[PDB]
Amino acid sequence: DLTISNELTGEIYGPIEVSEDMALTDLIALLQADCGFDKTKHDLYYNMDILDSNRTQSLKELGLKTDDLLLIRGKISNS
16 A cells, blocks of 8 residues: 555555565556656655666565555656
């Protein structure tokens, strides 16, 4: 049950079942798909801070889990 929040639109995306053997990318996939994630103008926050292109370290590498979360930030006024 991972919590995504659309920090721009104010939506709250629901208990996503994350398996550590998922692809953080496939997660970002749903994130872009449903959450409206757009790395190309967003900032996604993990825990308290933005990810990076260097942060190619997966769910299991990030430290994602039973109480994890992404946030969708960035854009025009925020980034």
